[PDB]
Design a binder for this molecule. Structure first.
Ligand SMILES: Nc1ncnc2c1ncn2[C@@H]1O[C@H](COP(=O)(O)OP(=O)(O)O)[C@@H](O)[C@H]1O
Ligand SMILES: Nc1ncnc2c1ncn2[C@@H]1O[C@H](COP(=O)(O)OP(=O)(O)O)[C@@H](O)[C@H]1O
Ligand SMILES: Nc1ncnc2c1ncn2[C@@H]1O[C@H](COP(=O)(O)OP(=O)(O)O)[C@@H](O)[C@H]1O
Ligand SMILES: Nc1ncnc2c1ncn2[C@@H]1O[C@H](COP(=O)(O)OP(=O)(O)O)[C@@H](O)[C@H]1O
Ligand SMILES: [Mg+2]
Ligand SMILES: [Mg+2]
Lengths: 76, 433, 438, 96, 445, 432
């Protein structure tokens, strides 16, 4: 049994590939392979074109007061 | 023990002055070559020079490989001796230069002192301690001890199904837990338990043993290039997903050199430079020879013995470049050439007699003379190979010794290369291609 | 019903057909003629059986159709299943997974068998009554009792927890004839001494019974484990090696592993744990090997773990593969010096007729004497293999016309329907332009 | 999942056509790795002996001021991989 | 199946019951001697008593070699395995050529397995232990049977089972109203969900509710499964379905063909022999058809000697249209069919001849019938004349372009003008070669 | 703006320029001349569209620059995007990962399209409340803009809901047959005004209509895609990476049978297409031998090929054959020959290229450029079109004149002039 090899390097080397978020763009807008097994044709083709939010709806919901409390169930 | 082609070679048969005795240690001739090999053996024993190359040159059957194995026998089993064939560098996993470099490091051995820490006893308490550690109680015939061990050791104990009453062996260096059996004291409780019982250890619970380990530089390189000592999931993953050999870098070899130098300075390691033997060197290509230039120029390299039976032959990997031994002239400038000669009929008879004694065969003088005459034509190898079939024929006929009739009958049954060549030439139109 | 093994080229060869003095009979065990070659093969077989000399090489050389492979198969059948016999073709060593030297090493090590013999205590009996009491809820110690019976004994065993678990997993019931190994606790069911209760449903059709074992319950039996050196190398190369025994995919085994295995097997042989059973490697059409493979063969035969190597080639003075050098048999002269050569002479008319008769007997084909004469003439004119093929061709033609014995007309019919190399080449010369590349 | 195999997929029951297509004889001619291990237990116990001459843990990368997120990320990855894969490696315990 | 391929008209060998070949039958025209020889080979295959026998179909291109092999396959039927293969397929980036050849050899040997699967289906109506009036040991209750009531569409049956099933019932969590099936050959209970009659429209479970089984409670059937030795070899070399780390690695790693060892193949052979002896399985030795055998190299040819000499090998049919060509992998070695003379000594050669104009016209008419094309007599004669020059394949390839041209012109049959226009539009090999030779300077290389 | 598709060598080709009778117009859809070749291509295109006959091979042969690739692109454009058209070069089958026959098999199976049609019942709504008792049984409330209902959950449904961490406000769909739950988004409320959002969260409107809905999905996949999907556990990943390897033939046979079953059941339709191999002379003899028998399958598309070789050497052999293709394969295919262009055709092609690139040229410039194209090559003149346009724009001109064409002729050399200049200084260049 031998001790392992301790390979020492400069701490700056470990940050060579790191890029600050304010210096890089979002690569998730080109992520096609990440949608496989998670996103369906229904969501992309039928649902989202019909049920996308608009700025008007978002503003109306944000400005409007809180909805009334949900009524308690009644056996009727 | 089976009798191989060189089983009679026990040494170089040299006297105290270095001169070669005529017949000694299973060698009959090649006195000059044996003296040169004795000098090479002294060079290897000096452990001072690095990367010194020797070429054994001569026709086939002149005992070049016998002389290499005699050098090995003279050195002893402690000194590493790596035999490789030139055809073995053509691997489908690593480059030819990598194969050569790995064989170079295999020739350098290291005798290193190691201390093994052992926990051995019958388990009396196995209490987990919340990742969960383990508190274990071990008893022997001399005492009892309680130990706190890492969670990995607890996982190993669980995998071994160790329960209270089992005799276990723990190696603290490698964390290797072995369950040996249920204690013998419980072997009477049941009539069919499906258990293997083991007596109680009669020493102490904790033992320290110092042993001498024989390793090579290649072993260290492999251990540090394909690690399996962490016992973690990543090691298993790497072993299963990457089982092939890899081209070990010069950086790893430099680190191993530093570690071994540190070990030698600490006084716990001894270096044995050792020997590499390449038998069919002409099978190497120009790339291998060019690499071997720099490899032999290294101050770490071992002593390398080369062999060749080729004449003025085209170097493999070149189109039409022809060199005296199949070896480019640049490498021949870096080698010491030992020349082997053809054997006289008397030496052939001596070798035949030695081989007969080695194979446990009694041969009459008339049969020995006839077989030496047979070896004068054809080859010595063919004459030696007729000993066992002739012995089998004599045994079938009820004779305990080989007579001339058995040798004649066997030679009639089996042809040699020249006779087969004559048959092929006479009937070229009937054979394929 | 037809088994997986059917009538092949060498199905009629049951052995070399030699007597005690290794003198070949004219026609015995399928072999006909080749007296000198069969005697030499017998001497080599005795050398193999003695198993004392390592790395012996024999070359069977002759014209096509002279019985080289027939002699090799006769040697294989005379050796028996106890001694390993690895038969490969020369082309098989060219592999994308391993080097040629590695493939040759694996072939060599597949021809040496390591046998471990040990004695173990064994309990074999008829289960009379088994009782297992287990806690209703939660972890607890199962307690059980087992009764085993032979023709002369009956003992009641108190069972441990692990033996209880083994019996539960094997689903051992009353009337089951079981075998128990005391050390490992392995239980193997080998039958039922009688049927289960009829009143139960969904039990299936009951099979045949097995007679109850006799003698004492706990006997002592000899267990033999036999593996080859290649199997040891593969299972020791890596953790997943045991699957590589079936999937191939062994890669290149480290030389360190093989050296350690050679040392351990030598230690076992000295310590009496294991015996080495050297065998034969038969490389058919060895002329497909290149110079590098032949150079490896030269030195690989110098090991004490090397088997007997038998080669067959029908080449004359031919270029060695991978080089531009002409050599006898396509083999370098350095390797030809390390081996004894066994020549096979062509067959005569009577030997050809006897071979045809043996083939007809193997194929269960009845043929007339005139048909035998015509077929022997065709075999002498064309080749032995062509006549052998015409045997079953004419058998099928005769059976089509509701016949019982193969006549000359059937042989002529199959001779017209199926062509040999000579007549096919003639007809191709007649239409040389119609064929694509000449 | 088992496309083109003598082993049929997990049929829900006899109502599915796949229930009556595959045979138990075909199933018993295919051995899983666990069955292979159970078949070679005696061979594993008697013939698996080769040990590497040297054993080392993997080389470690050390920096004076490393990114404080690299080590915890590697630790979490190793922990998850071990928790998912170590139970599956138990059959290979005797070989190791 | 609906699309028409080049050999869609070949329905077998047009052989009389006596083996003589009819002039035109089963889609085949002429080649009477070759068809008779192929019929003899078909009888050889059906006899199932020969192994490793090889047949070489030798003749000029376009003479029915592939058509004859496919006719042999049609004569054998789908029961007999038929593994087509071209010589170029042995060159793989994953396994060696000999492994590809061996795998195709094992693909040609088939196995038919017959088994009876007896099951008990139903919805559990009753689950009642059968106690004994004399409890063993004095205390507690002992049970000797467990009565399970199974209900199906057209019946209801009760099964007195072994007491040991109580554990299986609890493990499967079987209760009343659940649909289960019990296998006689194993004695195990499997819960295939709950009956759908107890499900409400407001439930959201997906695989829990199952329809009440139709038919009888006791269902037994004979299962015939056809497998090949290569199937067993591949399923055992790279097994699928384990839960150990090795199976997980197999699922993760990219699948790759491996060099299956002789040990695994011998084990498969032993298992197959055991099944055959038990009566479970029947061996079905088929045919391996290796088209363009001349594309094999010298290593493949050399390996084929040992492959054919085996007692497990199938009957191999080769086909080569080469003359005195040079064997691949060799330097300037010429053999009559691109095949070394050693392998030619192990094969029976069937010669295919060229077609007379009448046979070419018959084949063109058959192909027109297969493609659903009506052709006039004058157009047929012109296309046969075109086939006398050029080749037969060129003439049969003008049928569909001419039919399309007629349909565009508004006619339901091919006239001579349509064939003439198609012949003007499309060139054959010889005319293109003449053009190339006349303008060799303007072309490349 | 500048889109990813820009002016290429065949951007001016929109079709084969045929009428209803497949008679080629002199200049239609961007094609000039090659009347016989275009008519033959149209006949082949009708054969492709019918789809009845399998494994038909056509070779477009002719001198370099005679419109072979132009005709292939015209066929591809005229054929709808619905019908597959796999265009590969001969060199692309030489792969380090799979054999040549495997590459050709994948190319053949990429040319057959399978259009699937699945109809599935789903539940679609916004999650209002999830109550789980203790996790054996629970209730789920879903709502739309026009509906609201409560569902009783089982063990597997509860486990699936907990695995996906479905909570209130999430808009989800549940498949009735399989029970799988996919989250479409979440509803926006006043309290969900997050300052930072995860990479997958998105706010959607609550669905309208009825909670139970039918989902119909129609998509076109190729046989090669189905092979890759079923090659391994996550084989669909190889449709992105390309690390397919050699797919087992048994898998392909199973998929052929399954596709036939789908076609009988009405769940799939087969659209046989075209595999265009450009510069086939790069194929080796083994590839040609494989092609010989690959065309004989019932699932083989139309193989259109194009070579410009004369009687040359077959790759991998020492034999000479009329197109570099063995005569055995040439008997399996119809040859469409392209003739050299005339002066009028060259001028019309130059006009079409100028219109495509939006370059104005004088008639004298057109005459000079046509003379250059006849003397040197058509492609050289086509390149000079853009070169002269750039030079004209540099001198602040609006129409290319003869001076610009002469200037770019002096600046850029064709092969003949460059070869002459090299021969003048032959010793300067290396390895003559
Ligand atoms: N001088 C010698 N004395 C005794 N045996 C010898 C001698 N030389 C060779 N031999 C034996 O004869 C055989 C041929 O020698 P070998 O070393 O193989 O020749 P090569 O130089 O071709 O390798 C071997 O069995 C070897 O042991
Ligand atoms: N002496 C013999 N006795 C019996 N069968 C023979 C004999 N010689 C050849 N045969 C048979 O004839 C065929 C050709 O012989 P074979 O050994 O294959 O020739 P080769 O020397 O080329 O291997 C085989 O089927 C073989 O079994
Ligand atoms: N005798 C025949 N009867 C019917 N069709 C034939 C006949 N011979 C050839 N064909 C057909 O003509 C075409 C030519 O292919 P084929 O003759 O098989 O070429 P090859 O023999 O070189 O493989 C195929 O469609 C084949 O089915
Ligand atoms: N008939 C044609 N109509 C329009 N453009 C053509 C025509 N023939 C060739 N071209 C154009 O000339 C150039 C060369 O023709 P191309 O077909 O690529 O040559 P090849 O036939 O040698 O492949 C391309 O830019 C192509 O668009
Ligand atoms: Mg042979
Ligand atoms: Mg082009």
């Amino acid at each position: 049994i031998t001790p392992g090899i301790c390979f020492s390097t400069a701490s700056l080397v470990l940050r060579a590939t790191d890029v600050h978020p304010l210096q890089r763009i979002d690569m998730g807008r080109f992520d096609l392979i990440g949608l496989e097994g998670r996103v369906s044709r229904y969501e992309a083709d039928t649902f989202l074109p019909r049920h996308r939010l608009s700025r008007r709806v978002l503003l109306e919901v944000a400005t409007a007061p809180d909805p009334p409390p949900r009524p308690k169930p009644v056996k009727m | 023990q089976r009798i191989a082609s060189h089983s009679h070679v026990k040494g170089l048969g040299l006297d105290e002055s270095g001169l070669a005795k005529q017949a000694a240690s299973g060698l009959v001739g090649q006195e000059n070559a044996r003296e040169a090999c004795g000098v090479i053996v002294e060079l290897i024993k000096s452990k001072k020079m690095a990367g010194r190359a020797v070429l054994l040159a001569g026709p086939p059957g002149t005992g070049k490989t016998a002389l290499a194995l005699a050098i090995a026998q003279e050195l002893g089993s402690k000194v590493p001796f790596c035999p490789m064939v030139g055809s073995e560098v053509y691997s489908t996993e690593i480059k030819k230069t990598e194969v050569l470099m790995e064989n170079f490091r295999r020739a350098i051995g290291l005798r290193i002192k190691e201390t093994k820490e052992v926990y051995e006893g019958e388990v009396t308490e196995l209490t987990p301690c919340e990742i969960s550690h383990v508190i274990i109680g071990l008893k022997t015939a001399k005492g009892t001890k309680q130990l706190k061990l890492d969670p990995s050791i607890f996982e190993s104990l669980q995998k071994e199904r160790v329960e209270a009453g089992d005799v276990i062996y723990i190696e603290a260096n490698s964390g290797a837990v072995k369950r040996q059996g249920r204690c013998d004291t419980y072997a009477t409780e049941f009539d069919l338990e499906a258990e293997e019982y083991v007596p109680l250890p009669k020493g102490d619970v904790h033992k320290k043993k110092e042993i001498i380990q024989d390793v090579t530089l290649h072993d260290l390189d492999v251990a540090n290039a394909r690690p399996q000592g962490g016992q973690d999931i990543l090691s298993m993953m790497g072993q299963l997903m990457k089982p092939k050999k890899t081209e070990i870098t010069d950086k790893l070899r430099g680190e191993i050199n530093k570690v071994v130098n540190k070990y030698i300075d600490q006084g716990i390691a001894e270096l044995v430079p050792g020997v590499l033997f390449v038998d069919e060197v002409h099978m190497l290509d120009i790339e291998c020879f060019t690499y071997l230039h720099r490899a032999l120029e290294s101050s770490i390299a071992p002593i390398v013995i080369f062999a060749s039976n080729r004449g003025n032959c085209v170097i493999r990997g070149t189109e039409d470049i022809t060199s005296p031994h199949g070896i480019p002239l640049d490498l021949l400038d870096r080698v010491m050439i030992i020349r082997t000669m053809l054997y006289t009929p008397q030496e052939m008879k001596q070798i035949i007699k030695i081989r007969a004694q080695t194979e446990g065969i009694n041969i009459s003088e008339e049969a020995l003379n006839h077989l030496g005459e047979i070896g004068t034509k054809t080859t010595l190898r063919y004459s030696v190979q007729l000993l066992t079939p002739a012995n089998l024929l004599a045994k079938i006929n009820g004779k305990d010794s080989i007579e001339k009739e058995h040798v004649e009958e066997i030679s009639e049954l089996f042809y040699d290369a020249k006779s087969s060549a004559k048959i092929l030439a006479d009937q070229q139109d009937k054979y394929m291609k | 019903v037809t088994r997986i093994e059917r009538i092949g080229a060498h199905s009629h060869i049951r052995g070399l057909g030699l007597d005690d003095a290794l003198e070949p009979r004219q026609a015995s065990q399928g072999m006909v003629g080749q007296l000198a070659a069969r005697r030499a093969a017998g001497v080599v077989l005795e050398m193999i059986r003695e198993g004392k000399i390592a790395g012996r090489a024999v070359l069977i050389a002759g014209q096509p159709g002279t019985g080289k492979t027939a002699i090799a198969m006769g040697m294989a059948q005379a050796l028996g299943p106890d001694t390993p016999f690895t038969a490969i073709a020369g082309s098989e060593i060219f592999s994308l997974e391993m080097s040629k030297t590695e493939a040759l090493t694996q072939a060599f090590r597949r021809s040496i068998g390591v046998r471990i013999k040990e004695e173990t205590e064994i309990i074999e009996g008829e289960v009379v009554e088994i009782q297992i009491d287990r806690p209703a809820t939660g972890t607890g110690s199962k307690v059980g009792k087992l009764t085993l019976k032979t023709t002369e004994m009956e003992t009641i065993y108190d069972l441990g927890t692990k033996m209880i678990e083994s019996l539960t997993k094997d689903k051992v019931q009353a009337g089951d004839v079981i075998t128990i190994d005391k050390a490992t606790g392995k239980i193997s069911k080998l039958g039922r001494s009688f049927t289960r209760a009829r009143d139960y449903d969904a039990m299936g059709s009951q099979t045949k019974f097995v007679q109850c074992p006799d003698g004492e319950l706990q006997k002592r039996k000899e267990v033999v484990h036999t593996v080859s050196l290649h199997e040891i190398d593969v299972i020791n190369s890596r953790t997943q090696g045991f699957l590589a025994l079936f999937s191939g995919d062994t890669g290149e085994i480290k030389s360190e592993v093989r050296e350690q295995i050679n040392a351990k097997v030598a230690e076992w042989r000295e310590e009496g744990k294991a015996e080495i059973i050297p065998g034969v490697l038969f490389i058919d059409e060895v002329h497909m090997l290149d110079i590098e493979s032949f150079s490896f063969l030269n030195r690989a035969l110098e090991s004490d773990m090397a088997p007997v190597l038998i080669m067959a080639t029908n080449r004359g003075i031919t270029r060695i593969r991978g080089t531009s050098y002409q050599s006898p048999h396509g083999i370098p002269i350095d390797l030809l010096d390390r081996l004894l050569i066994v020549s096979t002479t062509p067959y005569s008319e009577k030997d050809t007729k006897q071979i045809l008769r043996i083939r007809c007997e193997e194929e269960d084909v009845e043929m007339s004497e005139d048909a035998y004469t015509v077929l022997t003439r065709i075999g002498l004119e064309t080749s032995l293999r062509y006549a052998i093929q015409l045997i079953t061709a004419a058998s099928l033609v005769c059976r089509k016309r509701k016949g019982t014995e193969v006549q000359v007309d059937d042989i002529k019919r199959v001779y017209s329907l199926f062509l040999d190399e000579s007549r096919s080449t003639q007809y191709m010369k007649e239409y040389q332009d119609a064929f694509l590349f000449n | 999942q088992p496309v083109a195999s003598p082993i049929g997929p997990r049929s829900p029951g006899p109502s599915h056509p796949t229930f009556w297509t595959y045979t138990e004889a075909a199933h018993r001619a295919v051995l899983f790795p666990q069955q292979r291990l159970d078949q070679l237990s005696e061979i594993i116990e008697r013939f698996i002996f080769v040990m590497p001459p040297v054993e080392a843990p993997p080389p470690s990368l050390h920096a004076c001021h490393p990114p404080p997120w690299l080590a915890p990320r590697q630790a979490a990855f190793q922990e998850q991989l071990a928790s998912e894969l170590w139970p599956r490696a138990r059959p290979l315990h005797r070989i190791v």
